[PDB]
């Protein structure tokens, strides 16, 4: 499949809104599923710095290609305006959207 450019008011339920450049300074992408390695996504590769996770949701980003690197979970909404500490802003790696549910 592929990601869908053009976000809405606010992402929720396993929904995450990416934003080229940090501090939402650039186009915005809407992903309500899974998106690893965004090099050939048609307008997205490299452009990945500020992101916003919806509430009642759990976004897990995996530093480096989703195949290797590291993984982290983010319950409830969240605002990652900058990802330089994660791995140089822009070109994050992979982002997954999963709601909270019994183990």
Swiss-Prot record:
- Residue ranges for the region (N-terminal arm) are 1-13
Example GO CC term: the record gives: membrane
Q: Does the keyword RNA-binding apply?
A: no
Entries under InterPro entries matching the protein: Beta/gamma_crystallin (IPR001064), Ca_cell_adhesion_N_dom (IPR015059), G_crystallin-like (IPR011024)
Tell me the function of this protein.
Answer: Structural protein.
Q: Which family does it belong to?
A: Belongs to the beta/gamma-crystallin family.
Which protein are we looking at? Answer: Spherulin-3A
**Source organism (scientific name):** Physarum polycephalum (Slime mold)
């Amino acid at each position: 499949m592929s990601v869908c450019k053009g976000v809405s008011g606010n992402p929720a339920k396993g929904e995450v809104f990416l934003y080229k450049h940090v501090n939402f300074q650039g186009d915005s992408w809407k992903v309500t599923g899974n998106v690893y390695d965004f090099r050939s996504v048609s307008g997205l590769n490299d452009v990945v710095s500020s992101v916003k996770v919806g509430p009642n949701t759990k976004a897990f980003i995996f530093k480096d290609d989703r195949f290797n690197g590291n993984f982290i979970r983010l319950e409830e909404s969240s605002q990652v305006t900058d990802l330089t500490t994660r791995n140089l802003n822009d070109a994050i790696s992979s982002i997954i959207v999963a709601t909270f549910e019994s183990a």
